[PDB]
């Protein structure tokens, strides 16, 4: 009967050294040093510099502290156990160290989850985004409490054993540390639940969040503020406007301009032409000048040219223009009209506002976010009557100064063209953090759900291969904590500044 008994009696002193022990050691030591130092720096940057103290960065500090815990405690024990195949610490640590590992996993996952949630409101629902440092402190304490409470079961089940259970002879060369379960099926439940809780579900939810985030952020990387600025224009706006109107063949007046595709139902030139017809009566039409620029279907080009022929203060341009002359136009006219129906970005508003042109535009899409109070006139889309009223309001305003109004336009457009860059880069960094985490913990999660549920990894030569696989998976799990500070290095100048500050 006694095969295991006797073959262990024979083969127990059969120590087999591995060829690349020094490689594994070098790997874990590199990780130890890099992770420890880098997470120290991540904490110090936020703790010294007041401008680093953002909710995002507080959660990142939590991540780094969990990483430091793991690096300080569990990495050495894993190295020793993966080198010697024996548990060289006490029975108490056999419970404590795996407990701390599980808790750190929990904390890292929950912290990434709140980071994703905060960014999700801030980007996808900015009006509902009520977030402060008080909320973050409370949330972090809750994360730690829940993580500590929920991983007590592992600490309970870990045990240090050696010889065969139920064996009279207790002679041994070493003892090991593994999970002791009195139930033969509930372990499957535990490890399934903890695969799903600590990995699957939170990663899927954060994937949803970041999909929606990056979909709100596509195509939003600002305008070239170094090209769109008055610095390359000559003279004063008065002389520039006089000169433009003289080149086109008009006397000085309040100039409105539209540039865009002659599209019916999108860029809204039809609405502008109809509003020009509405204003062709009245009395104040004589004080106004309009320029209409673009290309499209024959109907709208023809109707624009008809209005040009009818009225001497209306000019139409279908020639192909350089970006530089568009710049000069924006810095010469008085207002710009954007009668679009579905404008999703509003690059025209930004480009024209950085040059001082005041925007009159439909209250749709990106425009509503750019054009605020004290910096433009907003109109119900598709209504040429309200557009005519807006033009008349612009005229009444033009009988005054407007200079500070244009400077406000400039400030707004420059701040908006730089905030979305910051959003884009922050989101990129956090997505990369999440990806590194999700890959680092994929192998070992798969291996545990297989070992603990679908009976495997216990037979034939599937015992040396298993050794190699788990050794690598452990190392990778720990390399996570060296990787995250490296991400922070490369993808945020705000941390690079303070990594330099230390030397």
Ligand X SMILES: CC(C)CCC[C@@H](C)[C@H]1CC[C@H]2[C@@H]3CC=C4C[C@@H](O)CC[C@]4(C)[C@H]3CC[C@]12C
**Cα–chain-centroid distance for residue 95?**
38
Q: Is 255 in contact with 249 (CB distance < 8 Å)? A: no
Three-state SS annotation for 272-293: HHHHHHHHCCCCHHHHEEEEEE
Q: Pick from ligand JHC, ligand X, ligand OLA, none: which does 210 bind, CB < 5 to 8 A by kind?
A: ligand OLA
Q: Pick from ligand JHC, ligand OLA, ligand X, none: which does 211 bind, CB < 5 to 8 A by kind?
A: ligand OLA
Q: Pick from ligand JHC, ligand X, ligand OLA, none: which does 502 bind, CB < 5 to 8 A by kind?
A: ligand X
What is the 8-class DSSP label of residue 126? G
Among 52, 66, 97, 367, binds ligand JHC (CB under 6 A): 97
Q: Pick from ligand X, ligand JHC, ligand OLA, none: which does 40 bind, CB < 5 to 8 A by kind?
A: ligand X
Q: Does 77 bind ligand JHC (CB under 6 A)?
A: yes
Among 6, 181, 211, 490, binds ligand OLA (CB under 6 A): 211
Nearer to ligand JHC, 98 or 202 (CB): 98
Least distance (Å) between residue 108 CB and ligand X:
21
Q: Does 37 bind ligand X (CB under 6 A)?
A: yes
Least distance (Å) between residue 109 CB and ligand OLA:
15
Least distance (Å) between residue 191 CB and ligand JHC:
7
User: Which residues in the 188-227 window bind ligand JHC by CB under 6 A?
Assistant: none
Angle in degrees, CA 302, 306, 307, rounded to 5: 120
* Nearest residue to ligand OLA, scored by beta-carbon proximity: 214
Q: H or E segment at 31?
A: helix 21-48
Residue 264: closest CA among 255, 274, 279, 251:
274
DSSP secondary structure, 297-356, as one string: -HHHHHHHHHHHHH-TTEEEE-S---HHHHHHHHTTSSEEEE--SS-SS-HHHHHHHTTT
Q: Count Cβ neighbours within 10 Å for each residue of 180-199 and write b for 16 or more, e otherwise.
A: eeeeeeebbebbeebbeebb
Q: Does 477 bind ligand JHC (CB under 6 A)?
A: yes
Provide the 10 A C-beta neighbour count for residue 38.
25
Angle in degrees, CA 21, 25, 30, rounded to 5: 150
Output phi, psi for 488, to 5 deg: -55, -40
Radius of gyration of the chain (CA): 34
- Tokens 């216990």, residue? 458
Least distance (Å) between residue 94 CB and ligand X:
23
Least distance (Å) between residue 437 CB and ligand OLA:
12
Residue 381: closest CA among 257, 285, 265:
265
- Tokens 């070493």, residue? 174
Stretch that binds ligand X, among 32-40, 250-258, 368-376, 383-391 (CB under 6 A): 32-40
Q: Pick from ligand X, ligand OLA, ligand JHC, none: which does 207 bind, CB < 5 to 8 A by kind?
A: ligand OLA
Q: Which two tokens stand for residue 486?
A: 């490296």
**Cα–chain-centroid distance for residue 113?**
13
Q: Pick from ligand X, ligand JHC, ligand OLA, none: which does 31 bind, CB < 5 to 8 A by kind?
A: none
Nearer to ligand OLA, 205 or 466 (CB): 205
Q: Does 502 bind ligand X (CB under 6 A)?
A: yes
Q: Does 210 bind ligand OLA (CB under 6 A)?
A: yes
Q: Does 36 bind ligand X (CB under 6 A)?
A: yes
Nearer to ligand JHC, 179 or 386 (CB): 179
Q: Does 117 bind ligand OLA (CB under 6 A)?
A: no
Q: Pick from ligand OLA, ligand X, ligand JHC, none: which does 107 bind, CB < 5 to 8 A by kind?
A: none
> 62: annotated binding-site residue?
no
Nearer to ligand JHC, 122 or 177 (CB): 177
Contacts of 361 (CB under 8 A, 6+ apart): 336, 337, 338, 339, 340, 343, 346, 349, 367, 371, 376, 377, 378, 379
How many amino acids of this chain bind ligand X (CB under 6 A)?
7
Nearer to ligand OLA, 94 or 123 (CB): 123
Q: Does 29 bind ligand X (CB under 6 A)?
A: no
Which residues lie near ligand JHC (CB under 6 A)? 74, 77-78, 81, 97-98, 101-102, 105, 179, 444-445, 448, 474, 477
Q: Which residues are annotated as a binding site for suvorexant?
A: 448
């Amino acid at each position: 009967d006694y095969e295991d008994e006797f073959l262990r009696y024979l083969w127990r002193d059969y120590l087999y050294p591995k060829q690349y022990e020094w490689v594994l050691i070098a790997a874990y030591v590199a990780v130890f040093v890099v992770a420890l130092v880098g997470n120290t720096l991540v904490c110090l940057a936020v703790w010294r510099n007041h401008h680093m103290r953002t909710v995002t960065n507080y959660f990142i500090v939590n991540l780094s502290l969990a990483d430091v815990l793991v690096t300080a405690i569990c990495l050495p024990a894993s190295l020793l156990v993966d080198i010697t195949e024996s548990w060289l610490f006490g029975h108490a640590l056999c419970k404590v160290i795996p407990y701390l590992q599980a808790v750190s996993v929990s904390v890292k996952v929950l912290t990434l989850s709140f980071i994703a949630l905060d960014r999700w409101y801030a980007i996808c629902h900015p009006l509902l985004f009520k977030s402060t440092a008080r909320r973050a402190r409370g949330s972090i304490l809750g994360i730690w409490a829940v993580s500590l409470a929920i991983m007590v079961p592992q600490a309970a089940v870990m045990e240090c054993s050696s010889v065969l259970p139920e064996l009279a002879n207790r002679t041994r060369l070493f003892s090991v540390c593994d999970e002791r379960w009195a139930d033969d099926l509930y372990p499957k439940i535990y490890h399934s639940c903890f695969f799903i809780v600590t990995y699957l579900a939170p990663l899927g939810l954060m994937a949803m969040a970041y999909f929606q985030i990056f979909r709100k952020l596509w195509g939003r990387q600002g305008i070239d503020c170094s090209f769109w600025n008055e610095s390359y224009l000559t003279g004063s706006r008065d002389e520039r406007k006089k000169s433009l109107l003289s080149k086109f063949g008009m006397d000085e007046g309040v100039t409105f301009m539209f540039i865009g595709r002659f599209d019916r139902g999108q860029k809204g030139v039809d609405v502008l032409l109809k509003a020009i017809e509405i204003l062709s009566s009245k009395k104040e039409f004589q004080e106004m000048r309009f320029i209409i620029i673009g290309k499209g279907d024959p109907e709208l080009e023809g109707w624009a040219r008809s209005l040009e022929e009818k009225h001497g203060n209306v000019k139409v341009i279908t020639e192909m223009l350089s970006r530089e002359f568009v710049r000069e136009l924006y810095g010469s006219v008085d207002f710009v009209i954007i009668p679009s129906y579905f404008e999703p970005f509003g690059l025209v508003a930004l480009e024209a506002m950085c040059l001082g042109a005041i925007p009159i535009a439909s209250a749709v899409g990106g425009l509503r976010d750019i054009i605020t109070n004290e910096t433009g006139i907003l109109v119900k889309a598709g209504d040429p009557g309200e557009l005519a009223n807006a033009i008349l309001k612009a005229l009444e305003l033009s009988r005054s100064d407007l200079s500070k109004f244009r400077e406000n336009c400039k400030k707004r457009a420059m701040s908006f063209s730089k905030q979305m860059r910051a959003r884009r880069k922050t989101a990129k960094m956090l997505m990369v953090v999440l990806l590194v985490f999700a890959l680092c913990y994929l192998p070992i999660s798969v291996l545990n759900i297989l070992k603990r549920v679908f009976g495997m990894f216990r037979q034939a030569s599937d015992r040396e291969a298993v050794y190699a696989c788990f050794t690598f998976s452990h190392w990778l799990v720990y390399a996570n904590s060296a990787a995250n500070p490296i991400i922070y290095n490369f993808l945020s100048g705000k941390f690079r500044e303070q990594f330099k500050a230390a030397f």
